[PDB]
Design an enzyme around this catalytic site. Structure first.
Site: not given
Ligand code: HEM
Ligand code: HEM
Ligand SMILES: CCCCCCCCCCCCCCCCCC(=O)OC[C@H](COP(=O)([O-])OCC(O)COP(=O)([O-])OC[C@@H](COC(=O)CCCCCCCCCCCCCCCCC)OC(=O)CCCCCCCCCCCCCCCCC)OC(=O)CCCCCCCCCCCCCCCCC
Ligand SMILES: CCCCCCCCCCCCCCCC(=O)OC[C@H](COP(=O)([O-])OCC[N+](C)(C)C)OC(=O)CCCCCCCCCCCCCCC
Ligand SMILES: CCCCCCCCCCCCCCCC(=O)OC[C@H](COP(=O)([O-])OCC[N+](C)(C)C)OC(=O)CCCCCCCCCCCCCCC
Ligand SMILES: CCCCCCCCCCCCCCCC(=O)OC[C@H](COP(=O)(O)OCCN)OC(=O)CCCCCCCCCCCCCCC
Ligand SMILES: CCCCCCCCCCCCCCCC(=O)OC[C@H](COP(=O)(O)OCCN)OC(=O)CCCCCCCCCCCCCCC
Ligand SMILES: CCCCCCCCCCCCCCCC(=O)OC[C@H](COP(=O)(O)OCCN)OC(=O)CCCCCCCCCCCCCCC
Ligand SMILES: CCCCCCCCCCCCCCCC(=O)OC[C@H](COP(=O)(O)OCCN)OC(=O)CCCCCCCCCCCCCCC
Ligand code: HEC
Ligand code: HEM
Ligand code: HEM
Lengths: 126, 93, 247, 385, 57, 385, 93
Positions: F202, F206, F228-229, F272
Site C-alpha cells: 500500500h 501496484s 475483474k478479480d 508433496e
Molecule cells: C496456511 C494454510 C494451510 C496449508 C497450506 C495447509 C496445508 C495442509 C496440508 C497439505 C495438509 C495435508 C492434507 C492431506 O494431504 O490430507 C494439511 C492437513 C491438515 N491441516 Fe492444514 N493447512 C493450512 C491451514 C490449516 C489450519 C489453519 C488448520 C487448523 C485450524 C489446518 C488443519 C489441518 C488438519 C487438521 C490437517 C489434518 C489432515 C486433514 O484432515 O487433511 N490447516 N494441511
Molecule cells: C499468502 C500469500 C500471499 C498473499 C495473500 C499475497 C497478496 C498480495 C496481493 C493481494 C498483492 C496485490 C495484487 C498483486 O499485485 O498481485 C500482492 C502483491 C505482491 N506480492 Fe504478494 N501475496 C502473497 C505471497 C507473496 C509471495 C510468496 C511473493 C513473492 C516473494 C509475493 C510478492 C508480491 C509482490 C512482489 C507483489 C507486488 C506485485 C506488483 O504489484 O507488481 N507475495 N500480494
C-alpha cells in the site's frame, strides 16, 4: 450529554424559588467543597468535557485572556496531579474566583444549535 | 494517503489544544536531581492525606455489603442448624 | 446445607511441608508407601504413578526394580500371537488391585474406591482432610444417625456415611526404620505419601519459587528506582504564568 | 526524517509505542491495558507449548493434562502459568473495565473504543469457558453441561442449537474436540480485536484522571510510560509468580482433579471464579430463557453507558455521589460473585436477586439520576442569583 | 576514580551490554548455587540424601 | 466526508479495497494475490472445521482423518478441499512469484514487499510440511523422518536440534502432536504476514505490465478490479471444484493411505509435489550439510534478485533475451520438480545437478549479464553516433 | 498523526505524476454500450496476434527441456533394461 440550557433552566428555577434556594444551595456548596477541583487550581468551567461541537464553538469564541488563563489552570492541574499532591492553600481557587466565564458562550452556541435544529425540522403551516 | 475524520488529538506540533502564551516550563536534569527524594515524607504524610480524603467512599459501601453478607451467612447457618428447622420449613414452604 | 451434609471441616495440622521453604519428609514418603502397599493397595489404585518416579524420593533404583518385578504386566504377544505376561520394569505404572470398575464395585459393596493419585488435590482440605478422614472414625456413631448397612460413620466425609471401613489400627504395619506405627503415625505417613503422589514437583517448585520471587522482587525495586529516575525531570517541573499583553 | 518514522512497520511501532503522546497526568490505572497485553502474550505462548502435548479426546484429556503436570519438563510451570494467568487476565480486565467506568472513558469520543472492549470481554469470557472445559475434570463436564443446556431454553430451535453445540446428545468426545479447536482459535480473534481496540484508542488518545483535555501537557510514551509500565509489569510478574509457585491451586476449584464422570454429580456445579457474578445473574431469575437473556444483558448493559451518563464533566474524580455509587456497584459485583459461589438456599436467593437488581439499576437508573443531580448542584453551587 | 570507572564501563554501550551479559552468567551460576544450598540446608533431614544415609547407617 | 473515509476501520477497508488506486493497465496476472488470500481463507476455514474432529495422537491421527472421510457429514468435502486447496495455494503462489520475477516487482520501491513475500513463502512451505505430516500416512512419517534427519548434519548441535524437534528418538507421538500445534499456529503468522505484505504494497501501489509509472492513469479498485478479480475467483473455484469432486486424489501420493509404519520403507520417499523442486535441490548435493544449506539458499536466493537485476527498465515486457531466459528458468523449475519425483538413478542425478546449477545461475549469473547486455543494446539501437 | 516517508504514489488528487495538459479523455456509459462487442473477432484474430507474438519465448524452452527430459527418461529405460546392463554397471561403478 445533558444540555446546558436544561441545567440552567432547572438551576434558575431552584435559585429563584425562596424555599428551594435556602434548602439546596448550602448542600451544593458543600458538594463543591467536597468535590475538590479547586484544590488543584481549577474552576468548574475547565472541568467540562470539551470534545463536542458546542464546547469547541464556546472555546473558539472565548476571548484570549480567559483562554490563556484556562490553559494555565489546566496545565497546572496536570502537573499537580502528576506529583500526586494538592496546590498550596494560598494558591487554591477561591469561591469568589470560581465564576462561570464559559457559561454564556456555551448557552449562546447551544441556543444557536437548537435554533438550527428547529429550522431544519420545520413544517410550514399549509 | 487518505485523510481520516476530525479527531481531538493531533501529533507533536499540532495537538489541537488552544494557543499558549505566558506559561513557562522549568525542568532540571534528573542526572542533577535526587530520585527517591521525599519518599519517606510522602510515604507517611502524603499517603495519609490521600487515604483520609478518599476512604469513606470505599469503606462505607464495603462495610454495607460485608455486613449484609455476614448477616445473610449467619441467617443461613442458623436456618440449616437444629435450632432453626421450624423457621427453615416455614420460609422454605 | 446442614453441617452433616457439608461434613466437619478438617483442622489445620502442622505438616512438615506447610510453609514456603519446606519440603516433603521423604522418610515419611517411604513409610507412607509401606502403609500403602500393606493396607491401601488392597482396594485403592495408583494408576498415575510410575515406578521410576519413586526412585530418588523414597527408595533406591535397585529397591524399586524389585517391586516392579514383583508385579506383572501385559507383554507384546509372542510369535504365535498368544497373550503373554511380563515382569515389570521401572517405566511401568503402579497397578491397581481390580481389573475394572465392575470388579471394584463387586468387591466393595457397590461403592467404587477412588484412585488415590490426585486425591489430596481432589478434595477440599487436602492433607488435613485425608488425615482427619483416616483417623476420625468414631467407635459409635452419634445417637439418632440412621446408618445404612455396610456404611460406616465418619464426620469428615460429606454426608457422614462413608463406605470405607476403618482400616488403620495400632501396630498393623511393622515399619522398616522402627518407627512406632500407631494409627495416627501411619495416617501421617500415608497422607504425606498421597500428597507426594498428587504433587511430585513440590520441592523443585518451591525451590524455583524462591529463585523467582527473589529475582522479581529485586527487579520490581530496581524498576521503581529507574521509573523515578526517568520521571524526575518531569516530576519536578515548575510552570509560571505572566499573563500576556492585550493586543 | 528518522528511520523509525519513515519505515513502513517502524512507523506503526513508533506512533503506537515510541512517539505516542500520552497525557502527563495518567496514573497506574492506565497500566492495566499494557498488563492485559502482557497477560494475553503469556496465555498464548504457554497455551501453544501445552497444546504441543495435550490430547483432546474425551479419554485422553484429563490424563494428558496430568501428563503435562508429570512428564513434561517444567510442565507444571506451563499449566499453573496458564490457569493462574487466566485468573490474573480476568483480574486485570476487571480493573481495566472499572477504570473505564470510573474515569468515564466510555464517553462521547471513545464510544467505539468502549464497544470494542466489550466485544473483547465477551470473547475472553468465552475463551476462558472453552479452555476450562478442555481440562475435562469434574467441574469442566458439569459446567459445560449446565452452560450448554442453557441454550435448550430457546423456544423454536433450542434442542437443535444444543445438539449442534454438543456434537451429540451430551458433553462427550465431539464436544471436547470442538472446545479444544475453538479454544485454540478464539485468542487470535481476541488479538485482532485488541489491534482494533488500539486503533480506536489511537485516533483520539487516552483520557486522564481529571477528565479535562490532555492536549496541552503531553509526554511521549517511550522512556516515560515504558518504565511506568515496566514497574507494574514486574509487580504483576511478582504476584503471578507467588500464585504460580507457592499457592498454585488457590483460585481453582479442587473438584477438577476428579476425572470427568457424567454419571456422578459433584453436589456444587460452580464455574471459575471470574464467571461467578454472571452465574449469579443467571441463577437469580427463575426461568431458563429469561436467565440466559439476563446474563447476556448483564454483559451487554455496558453499551448503554455512554447514553445514560447525563453528566457534563467526565469521570467521577470530582463527583461525590458518583464515587459513592461506583463503589456500591463494585462491592455489589463482589457480593454477586460471592452469592454465585454459594448454594441455592434461602437468604442467598433474595440476596442474589436484590444484587442483580442493583447491578442493572446502576447503569439504567442510578447513573442518569445521580449525574443529573450533580449537573444541577454544580450549576447552583457557583451561580449566584 | 569515578572518571576512570565511567570511561571504562559505561562510556561504550558495547562494553556496557557485554558486562551485563558477563555479570548475568556469573550471577546465574552463583545465585542458583546459593539458593540450592540454602534450600537443602534449611531442609536437613528431610531430603532423600539424608533418608538414604539413615538407611545406610 | 463520507463515512467510509471518516470511520476508523472503514477507512482501512476503503483505502485498501474500495478506493485503492490501481493502474488501469494491469492484467489477470494481478489477480493471483487476491486468489492467494482466497486460498488462505479456504485453508483456514476447512482446517478449523477438521480440527474439530482430528486427533493428533500417533494411534489416532490416521484413524481420525479416516473418521473425517467416513463418519463426519461432508467431511470428505472438507478434507479434499483442504488438501487440493493447499495444492492450489501453491500453484497460485508460484504464479504470484513468477509474475513478480517477470514484471520486475522486486525492484527499488518494493524491495520490502518482495522480502516480506519471501518470508510468507517460507512460512507457507513450513505449514504445508507440518500439515502433510499431520495425516501420518506412509509418506508423512517418512517425509518427517528424512526432512528432520537433515538437521543432524550441523556439526555442533545437530543431534540436539534433531532430538528436540522429534521430542524423542524418532518421529513419534510427541512429534505428531508438536506438528499439529504448529500447523494450527503458523497460518495465523501467515495472516499477520499477509497484513504486512499489504502494508508494504500500500505504501507504493501496484506495478503494471509496462514497467512505466502508473501515477498518470489510475482507477479505484472497487467496481473495476472487484469484478475483474471475481472472474478469476469463480474460475479458481471451478478448477478447485473439479479437482475436489471428480479427481480428488490426483495430486496426492497413493502411499498416504497406508498407515504410518516406522519399520517399512515405502521404496520411494517423496514429499508433496510443490516441495519437489526443493527436494531435488536437496538431493543434488552429495553432502547432508551442504544439501540443506543449498535448499535454504534455493528459497533465499530470491533476496539477491533486487541487487542483481541490473536493468534500467523494469520488467521483461520489452526485453527479448530476458523473456527467453525467464521461461528457461520456469521450465527448469518444472524439470527440477520432475527430477525430484524420480528415483536416484544415473541420468537423473546429473540432470538434477545441472538443473540446480541453472536455477542458481539464473539469479546470480544470467540476470546481471543479460540485463547489462540489454542496457547496451537499448542504448546503441537508438543513439546515432 | 505522524507523516510517513516520501512515497512514489499519493491519493486521489496528489498522485505525484507530471502536470498534464492538452490530454482530453472521452468515455461513454457502459449502459449505452455493447459489452461482448468484438469478442468473436478478437477471439480468432487478436488472440492469434498475441499467440504469434509470444510463442517462441514460451515454446523453445519448453521444447528444449521436454526433449531433454524425454531423452533422459529413455536413457534410464534403456539402462534398467536387459540389453543395457553392461553399460549400467559401467556407468554405475
Ligand atoms: C496456511 C494454510 C494451510 C496449508 C497450506 C495447509 C496445508 C495442509 C496440508 C497439505 C495438509 C495435508 C492434507 C492431506 O494431504 O490430507 C494439511 C492437513 C491438515 N491441516 Fe492444514 N493447512 C493450512 C491451514 C490449516 C489450519 C489453519 C488448520 C487448523 C485450524 C489446518 C488443519 C489441518 C488438519 C487438521 C490437517 C489434518 C489432515 C486433514 O484432515 O487433511 N490447516 N494441511
Ligand atoms: C499468502 C500469500 C500471499 C498473499 C495473500 C499475497 C497478496 C498480495 C496481493 C493481494 C498483492 C496485490 C495484487 C498483486 O499485485 O498481485 C500482492 C502483491 C505482491 N506480492 Fe504478494 N501475496 C502473497 C505471497 C507473496 C509471495 C510468496 C511473493 C513473492 C516473494 C509475493 C510478492 C508480491 C509482490 C512482489 C507483489 C507486488 C506485485 C506488483 O504489484 O507488481 N507475495 N500480494
Ligand atoms: C493495604 C491497602 C492500601 C492501604 C492504603 C495505603 C495506600 C494509600 O494510602 O493510597 C491511597 C489511594 C487513594 O488516593 P488517591 O490519590 O485518591 O488515589 C490515587 C490514584 O488511584 C492514583 O494512584 P497512584 O498513581 O498514586 O498509584 C496507584 C496505586 C495502585 O496501583 C495499581 O492500581 C496497580 C494495580 C496492581 C498491579 C499489579 C496487578 C496484579 C494483578 C492481580 C491484582 C490483584 C490485586 O498504587 C499506590 O497507591 C502506591 C502507594 C502505596 C502507598 C503505601 C503506603 C502505606 C502506608 C505506609 O488508594 C490506593 O491507591 C489503593 C491502591 C493500592 C491497594 C493495594 C491493595
Ligand atoms: C516512620 C518514619 C518515616 C516517616 C517520618 C519522616 O517523615 O522522616 C523523614 C525522613 C526522611 O525524609 P525525606 O523526605 O526522605 O528527606 C528528603 C530530604 N529533606 C526533606 C529532609 C530535605 O525519614 C527518615 O530518615 C527515617 C528513615 C527510616 C528508614 C526505615 C526503613 C523502613
Ligand atoms: C468463431 C469463428 C469466428 C470467425 C471470425 C468472424 O466470424 O468474424 C467476426 C464476426 C463478428 O463478430 P463480433 O466479433 O461480435 O463483431 C461484432 C460486429 N461488429 C462489432 C463488427 C459490428 O464473428 C461472428 O459473427 C461469429 C458469430 C458466430 C457465433 C458462433 C461461433 C461458433
Ligand atoms: C542490532 C541492529 C543494529 C542496526 C544498526 C542501527 O541501529 O541503525 C540505526 C538506525 C538509524 O536510524 P536514523 O533515524 O539515524 O536514520 C538516519 C539515516 N541517515 O536506527 C534504526 O535502525 C531504527 C531504530 C528504531 C528502533 C525501534 C525499536 C523497536 C522496538 C519494538 C520492537 C518490535 C516490537 C513489535 C511489537
Ligand atoms: C498491548 C500492547 C501495549 C502497548 C504498550 C506496551 C508498553 C511496553 C510494556 C512492556 C515494558 C517493556 C520495557 C522495555 C524497556 C526498554 O525497551 O528499554 C529501552 C531503554 C532505552 O533507553 P533510552 O532510550 O532511555 O536511553 C537513554 C540513553 N540512550 O534501554 C534501557 O534502559 C534498558 C534497561 C533495561 C530494561 C530491561 C527490560 C526487560 C523487560 C522484560 C519484560 C518485558 C515484557
Ligand atoms: C447494513 C445497512 C446499515 C445502514 C447503511 C446506511 O444507512 O448507509 C450510511 C453509510 C454511509 O453514509 P454516508 O457516507 O453517505 O454519510 C453519512 C452521513 N449522511 O453507509 C456506510 O456505512 C458505508 C457503506 C460501506 C460499507 C463497506 C463494507 C466493506 C467491508 C466488507
Ligand atoms: C468476532 C468478530 C466481530 C467483528 C466486529 C468488528 C466490528 C467492530 C465493532 C465496532 C462496534 C462499534 O461501536 O462501532 C461503531 C463505530 C462508530 O463509528 P465512529 O466512531 O466513526 O462514529 C461515531 C460518531 N461520532 O464504528 C462503526 O460504525 C463500525 C462499522 C463498520 C465496522 C468495520 C468493519 C470491520 C473492518 C475491520 C478491519 C480489520 C483491520 C484489522 C487488522 C487486523
Ligand atoms: C478396602 C475395601 C479398602 C481399604 C483397605 C481402603 N479403602 Fe479407602 N475407600 C474404600 C471405599 C469402598 C471407598 C468409597 C467410599 C464412599 O464413597 O462411600 C473408599 C474411599 C476413600 C477416599 C475418598 C473419601 C472421599 O471421597 O471423601 C479416600 C481419600 C480413601 N479411601 C483413602 C484410603 C487410604 C489412604 C487407605 C489406606 C492406607 C484406604 N483408603 C484403604 C475402600 C478401602
Ligand atoms: C485468551 C487467552 C487464553 C485464556 C483466557 C485461556 C484460558 C484457559 C483456561 C482458564 C484454561 C483452564 C486452565 C485449567 O484449569 O487447567 C485453559 C486451558 C487450556 N488452554 Fe487456554 N487460554 C488462553 C489461550 C490459549 C491458547 C491460544 C491455547 C492454545 C494454543 C490454549 C491452550 C490451552 C490448553 C491446551 C488448555 C488445556 C488444559 C491445561 O493444560 O491447562 N490456551 N485455557
Ligand atoms: C485483551 C484485553 C484488552 C487489551 C489488551 C486492552 C488494551 C488496552 C490498552 C493497551 C489500552 C491503553 C492503556 C490504557 O488506557 O489502559 C486500552 C485502553 C482502553 N481500554 Fe482496553 N484492552 C482490553 C480490554 C478492554 C476491555 C474489556 C474494556 C472495557 C470494555 C476496555 C476498554 C478500554 C478503554 C475504555 C480504554 C481507554 C481508557 C483511557 O485511556 O481513557 N478494554 N486498552
Amino acid at each position: 450529554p445533558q444540555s446546558f440550557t436544561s441545567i440552567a433552566r432547572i438551576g434558575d428555577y431552584i435559585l429563584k424559588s425562596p424555599v428551594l434556594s435556602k434548602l439546596c444551595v448550602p448542600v451544593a456548596n458543600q458538594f463543591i467543597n467536597l468535590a475538590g477541583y479547586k484544590k488543584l487550581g481549577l474552576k468548574f468551567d475547565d472541568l467540562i468535557a470539551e470534545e463536542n461541537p458546542i464546547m469547541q464553538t464556546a472555546l473558539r469564541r472565548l476571548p484570549e485572556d480567559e483562554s490563556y488563563a484556562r490553559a494555565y489552570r489546566i496545565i497546572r492541574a496536570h502537573q499537580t496531579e502528576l506529583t500526586h499532591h494538592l496546590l498550596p492553600r494560598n494558591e487554591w481557587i477561591k469561591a469568589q474566583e470560581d465564576v462561570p466565564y464559559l457559561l454564556p458562550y456555551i448557552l449562546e452556541a447551544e441556543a444557536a444549535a437548537k435554533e438550527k435544529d428547529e429550522l431544519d425540522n420545520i413544517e410550514v403551516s399549509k | 494517503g487518505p485523510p481520516s475524520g476530525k479527531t481531538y488529538m493531533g501529533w507533536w506540533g499540532h495537538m489541537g489544544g488552544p494557543k499558549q502564551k505566558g506559561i513557562t516550563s522549568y525542568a532540571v536534569s534528573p542526572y542533577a536531581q535526587k530520585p527517591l527524594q521525599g519518599i519517606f515524607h510522602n510515604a507517611v504524610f502524603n499517603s495519609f492525606r490521600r487515604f483520609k480524603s478518599q476512604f469513606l467512599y470505599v469503606l462505607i459501601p464495603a462495610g454495607i455489603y460485608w455486613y449484609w453478607w455476614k448477616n445473610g451467612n449467619e441467617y443461613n447457618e442458623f436456618l440449616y442448624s437444629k435450632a432453626g428447622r421450624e423457621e427453615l420449613e416455614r420460609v422454605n414452604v | 446445607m446442614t453441617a452433616a451434609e457439608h461434613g466437619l471441616h478438617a483442622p489445620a495440622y502442622a505438616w512438615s511441608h506447610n510453609g514456603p521453604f519446606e519440603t516433603f519428609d521423604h522418610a515419611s514418603i517411604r513409610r507412607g508407601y509401606q502403609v500403602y502397599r500393606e493396607v491401601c493397595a488392597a482396594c485403592h489404585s495408583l494408576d498415575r504413578v510410575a515406578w521410576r518416579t519413586l526412585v530418588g524420593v523414597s527408595h533406591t533404583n535397585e529397591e524399586v526394580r524389585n517391586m516392579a518385578e514383583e508385579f506383572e504386566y501385559d507383554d507384546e504377544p509372542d510369535e504365535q500371537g498368544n497373550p503373554k505376561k511380563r515382569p515389570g520394569k521401572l517405566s511401568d505404572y503402579i497397578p491397581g488391585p481390580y481389573p475394572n470398575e465392575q470388579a471394584a464395585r463387586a468387591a466393595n459393596q457397590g461403592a467404587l474406591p477412588p484412585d488415590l493419585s490426585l486425591i489430596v488435590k481432589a478434595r477440599h482440605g487436602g492433607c488435613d482432610y485425608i488425615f482427619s478422614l483416616l483417623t476420625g472414625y468414631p467407635d459409635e456413631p452419634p445417637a439418632g444417625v440412621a446408618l445404612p448397612p455396610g456404611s460406616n460413620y465418619n464426620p469428615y466425609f460429606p454426608g457422614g456415611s462413608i463406605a470405607m471401613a476403618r482400616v488403620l489400627f495400632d501396630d498393623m504395619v511393622e515399619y522398616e526404620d522402627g518407627t512406632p506405627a500407631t494409627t495416627s503415625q501411619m495416617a501421617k505417613d500415608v497422607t504425606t505419601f498421597l500428597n507426594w503422589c498428587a504433587e511430585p514437583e513440590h520441592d523443585e517448585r518451591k525451590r524455583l519459587g524462591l529463585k523467582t520471587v527473589i529475582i522479581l522482587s529485586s527487579l520490581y525495586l530496581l524498576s521503581i528506582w529507574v521509573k523515578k529516575f526517568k520521571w524526575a525531570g518531569i516530576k519536578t517541573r515548575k510552570f509560571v504564568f505572566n499573563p500576556p499583553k492585550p493586543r | 526524517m528518522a528511520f523509525r518514522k519513515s519505515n513502513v512497520y517502524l512507523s506503526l511501532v513508533n506512533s503506537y509505542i515510541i512517539d505516542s503522546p500520552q497525557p502527563s497526568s495518567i496514573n497506574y490505572w492506565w497500566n492495566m491495558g499494557s498488563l492485559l497485553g502482557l497477560c494475553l502474550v503469556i496465555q498464548i505462548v504457554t497455551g501453544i507449548f501445552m497444546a504441543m502435548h495435550y490430547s483432546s479426546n474425551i479419554e485422553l484429556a484429563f490424563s494428558s493434562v496430568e501428563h503435562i503436570m508429570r512428564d513434561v519438563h517444567n510442565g507444571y510451570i506451563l499449566r499453573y502459568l496458564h490457569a493462574n494467568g487466566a485468573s490474573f487476565f480476568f483480574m486485570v480486565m476487571f480493573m481495566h473495565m472499572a477504570k473505564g467506568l470510573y474515569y468515564g472513558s466510555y464517553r462521547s469520543p471513545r464510544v467505539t473504543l468502549w464497544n470494542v472492549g466489550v466485544i473483547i470481554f465477551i470473547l475472553t469470557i468465552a475463551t476462558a469457558f472453552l479452555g476450562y472445559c478442555c481440562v475435562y475434570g469434574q467441574m469442566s463436564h458439569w459446567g459445560a453441561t449446565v452452560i450448554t443446556n442453557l441454550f435448550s431454553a430457546i423456544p423454536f430451535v433450542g434442542n437443535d442449537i444444543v445438539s449442534w453445540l454438543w456434537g451429540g446428545f451430551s458433553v462427550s468426545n465431539p464436544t471436547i474436540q470442538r472446545f479444544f479447536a475453538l479454544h485454540y482459535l478464539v485468542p487470535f480473534i481476541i488479538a485482532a480485536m485488541v489491534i482494533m481496540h488500539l486503533m480506536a484508542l489511537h485516533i483520539h488518545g487516552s483520557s486522564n484522571p481529571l477528565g479535562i483535555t490532555g492536549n496541552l501537557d503531553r509526554i511521549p510514551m517511550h522512556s516515560y510510560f515504558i518504565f511506568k509500565d515496566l514497574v507494574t509489569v514486574f509487580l504483576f510478574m511478582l504476584i503471578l509468580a507467588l500464585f504460580v509457585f507457592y499457592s498454585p491451586n488457590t483460585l481453582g476449584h479442587p473438584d477438577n482433579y476428579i476425572p470427568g464422570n457424567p454419571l456422578v454429580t459433584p453436589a456444587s456445579i460452580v464455574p471459575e471464579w471470574y464467571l461467578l457474578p454472571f452465574y449469579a445473574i443467571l441463577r437469580s431469575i427463575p426461568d431458563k430463557l429469561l436467565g440466559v437473556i439476563t446474563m447476556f444483558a448483564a454483559i451487554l448493559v455496558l453499551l448503554v453507558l455512554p447514553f445514560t451518563d447525563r453528566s457534563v464533566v467526565r469521570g467521577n474524580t470530582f463527583k461525590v455521589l458518583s464515587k459513592f455509587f461506583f463503589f456500591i456497584f463494585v462491592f455489589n459485583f463482589v457480593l454477586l460473585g460471592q452469592i454465585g459461589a454459594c448454594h441455592v438456599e434461602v437468604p442467598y436467593v433474595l440476596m442474589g436477586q436484590i444484587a442483580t437488581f442493583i447491578y442493572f439499576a446502576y447503569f439504567l437508573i442510578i447513573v442518569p439520576v445521580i449525574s443529573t443531580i450533580e449537573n444541577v448542584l454544580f450549576y447552583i453551587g457557583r451561580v449566584n442569583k | 576514580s569515578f572518571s576512570s570507572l565511567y570511561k571504562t564501563f559505561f562510556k561504550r554501550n558495547a562494553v556496557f551490554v557485554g558486562t551485563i551479559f558477563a555479570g548475568a552468567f556469573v550471577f546465574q551460576t552463583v545465585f542458583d548455587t546459593a539458593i540450592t544450598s540454602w534450600y537443602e540446608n534449611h531442609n536437613k533431614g528431610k531430603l532423600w540424601k539424608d533418608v538414604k544415609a539413615r538407611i545406610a547407617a
